[PDB]
Amino acid sequence: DIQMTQSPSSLSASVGDRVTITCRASQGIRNDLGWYQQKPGKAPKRLIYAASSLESGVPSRFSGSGSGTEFTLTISSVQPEDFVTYYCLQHNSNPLTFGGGTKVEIKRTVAAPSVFIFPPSDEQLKSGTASVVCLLNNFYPREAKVQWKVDNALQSGNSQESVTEQDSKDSTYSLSSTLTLSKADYEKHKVYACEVTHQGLSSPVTKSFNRGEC
Amino acid sequence: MDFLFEKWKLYSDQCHHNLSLLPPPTELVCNRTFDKYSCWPDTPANTTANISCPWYLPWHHKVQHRFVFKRCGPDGQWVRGPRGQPWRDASQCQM
Amino acid sequence: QVQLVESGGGVVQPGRSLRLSCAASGFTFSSYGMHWVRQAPGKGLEWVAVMWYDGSNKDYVDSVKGRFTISRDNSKNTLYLQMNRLRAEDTAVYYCAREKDHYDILTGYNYYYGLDVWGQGTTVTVSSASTKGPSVFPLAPSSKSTSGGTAALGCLVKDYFPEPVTVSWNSGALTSGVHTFPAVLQSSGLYSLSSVVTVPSSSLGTQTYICNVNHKPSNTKVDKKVEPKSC
């Protein structure tokens, strides 16, 4: 079973940089390999075939290389539309295998996120459930750490996060994190706090609302 | 060019026919076949079958005394290649 | 214009079966090997199955062996994927791809050239969830700083199925500062997303903010007002 180790999982670039993506096959695969680009919401689209050949109608900045066990995808000068996911595919032996993929992200300056906390809405409480949402707005880089505390009790297993794709205008990320629990747990506890840990920060930030929908 | 294809198609047609007139197997085998290269009979499992190099080869007069081999697995299945295609040892028959 | 077009996707309960189709055009379907590839929601690509002409050369990825069946109807240039005893891991977008091979007569070798043409894809969602409209909850601004700075508000689109839901603000009039987050799959099997927007804190009390939630599957169209609180 041939493994395709792809590197890195995600990278950082400014338009004009040279980008290099590596693919290491666990078994000699001669030149039976192709590189793929997949734009969000769209199907993969082969760019390089036979390891180093360029598909017809693809920019001259894309080039593949290597044979046997080591392969490389290169973009001489990254372009704004090139910041998307890339995959290597080996067609030497069944089953066919892909690399984990590479998400190419455009880089900007660090940006601490602006944080907001929203208590449950009266209308929901009427239902028997309570959602406390915490918003990390327009930050960078993506790496962020959100922690819930109710009565300063670190919560675990009761939340879910979701992050938006990098913004076209400022290139930032924003994430929403929903801590959910019962009206009962919600109505016996007192103070609900959202602590955010990020780079653009120094000291972990905490936005706290208390029971009484304050 | 084509003439090679024509001799090759001849060879295939001939083994598709050659193989119709055969008795049913009495044991665990690998169904007879034309693997696109040579015509194989019913071969007992876990054994390797041999054949004189196919005559559509242009150099068949120099390898007429040589052989192509095809392994039949213990499974009752001919061994396939990397991509699952008909597989064989034709090194003796190559140029 | 060489093309592949896939259909047959949808919601199907675990245990049950689905049939996928891949219609081809612009080329001679018979002279090529066809593949299926899938992609779980936030994951990468995974090869699933492959057939040929004969079709005596069918291969499947281990996890679908004895469960999925690949077939092709050359009379009507169509690829199929029979999916039986479906389960959670089958939830994904399924693509179909084309691959050319070449048989060398002289050498008896078979050469393969990889996957060059794909289809748009088709989604398979394995679940026992029923079509359901979302419950729309406001997320209110607060501080309360006098006469304020900049604020944030939004809507909680909770407990719907299946995807997607489209969200607008003031009927599309407000597009600045708006972040509609990707939906999460809750432990209940229901989806839930948050749509948010940041506004100047002074515009509050005057500007009226309404989110416009649209969930097509359930023909649910909701407009919810978002106002500040008291306490």
Q: Which of A203, A208, A98 is nearest to A150 (CA)?
A: A208
> Residue C124, Cβ neighbours under 10 Å: how many?
20
Distances (CA, A) of A196 to A147, A153, A167, B10, C196: 6, 15, 20, 77, 18
Domain C1-128: CATH architecture, name and number where available? Sandwich (2.60)
Which residues 163-182 of chain A have a CB within 8 Å of chain C? 163-164, 174-176, 178, 180
Please, which residues have CB within 8 angstroms of residue C75's CB and are 6 or more apart in sequence? none
Q: In units of Å, what resolution does this entry have?
A: 2.7
What are the residues whose beta carbons fall under 8 Å from the beta carbon of C206, sequence distance 6 or more?
none
Q: How far apart are CA C180 and CA C194, in angstroms?
A: 6
Q: Fold for A109-214, please state it.
A: Immunoglobulin-like (2.60.40)
Q: Do A44 and C120 touch (CB under 8 A)?
A: no
Rounded Cα distance, C194 and C179, in Å: 9
Q: Which residues of B touch A91 (CB under 8 A)?
A: 83
DSSP character at residue B15 = H
Contact A92/B at CB under 8 A: yes
State whether C108 and B84 contact (CB < 8 Å).
no
The CATH code of domain C129-231 reads 2.60.40.10
Interface test with A, best of B80, B83, B85 (most A CBs within 10 A): B83
Return the number of CB contacts < 8 Å for A and C: 124
Q: Do B56 and C105 touch (CB under 8 A)?
A: yes
What are the residue ranges spanned by the domains of chain C?
1-128, 129-231
d(CA A194, CA A206): 6
Q: How far does chain A reach from its first CA to its final CA, in angstroms?
A: 59
What is the number of other CB atoms lying within 10 angstroms of the CB of residue C111?
13
Q: Counting beta carbons within 10 angstroms of the beta carbon of residue B76, is it exposed (0 to 12), middle (13 to 18) or buried (19 or more)?
A: middle
Q: According to CATH, where is 2.60.40.10 located in chain A?
A: 1-108, 109-214
Helix (H, G, I), strand (E, B) or coil at B6: helix
Task: Provide the residue type at C13 as one letter.
Answer: Q
Interface test with chain A among C32, C115, C230, by most A beta carbons within 10 Å: C115
Q: Is A21 exposed, middle or buried (0-12, 13-18, 19+ CB in 10 A)?
A: buried
What is the 3-state secondary structure of chain A?
CCCEEEECCEEEECCCCCEEEEEEECCCCCCCEEEEEECCCCCCEEEEECCCEECCCCCCCEEEEEECCEEEEEECCCCHHHCCEEEEEECCCCCCEECCCEEEEECCCCECCEEEEECCCHHHHCCCEEEEEEEEEEEECCCCEEEEEECCEECCCCEEEEECCCCCCCCCEEEEEEEEEEHHHHHHCCEEEEEEECCCCCCCEEEEEECCCC
- Do domains C1-128 and C129-231 share one topology? The answer is yes
In angstroms, rounded to a whole number, what is the distance separating the alpha carbons of residues C32 and C2? 13
Residues in chain C closer than 8 A to A139 (CB atoms): none
What are the two backbone dihedrals, phi and then psi, of residue C229, each rounded to the nearest 5 degrees?
Answer: -105, -170
| Opening angle at CA A96, ends A92 and A100, nearest 5 | 115
Task: Count CB-CB contacts under 10 A for residue A19.
Answer: 20
> What is the maximum span of chain A, computed from C-alpha positions, in angstroms?
68
Architecture of domain A1-108: Sandwich (2.60)
Experimental method: X-ray
Query: What 8-state DSSP symbol labels residue B27?
Result: S
What type of residue sits at position A17? D
**Tokens, residue C61:** 């990825």
Tokens of C196: 């948010």
| B88 closest CB neighbour out of C58, C106, C108 | C108
CA angle A179, A183, A184 (to 5 degrees): 110
Q: Which residues contact B17 (CB under 8 A, 6 or more apart)?
A: none
3-state SS of C117-131 is EEECCEEEEECCCCC
| CA distance readout (Å), A5 to A25, A72, A143, C1 | 6, 12, 23, 34
Kindly report the nearest CA distance between residue C107 and chain A, in angstroms.
18
Residue type, A108: R
Nearest Cα of chain A lies from the Cα of C76 at a distance, in angstroms, of 24
Is B1-95 a CATH 4.10.1240.10 domain?
Answer: yes
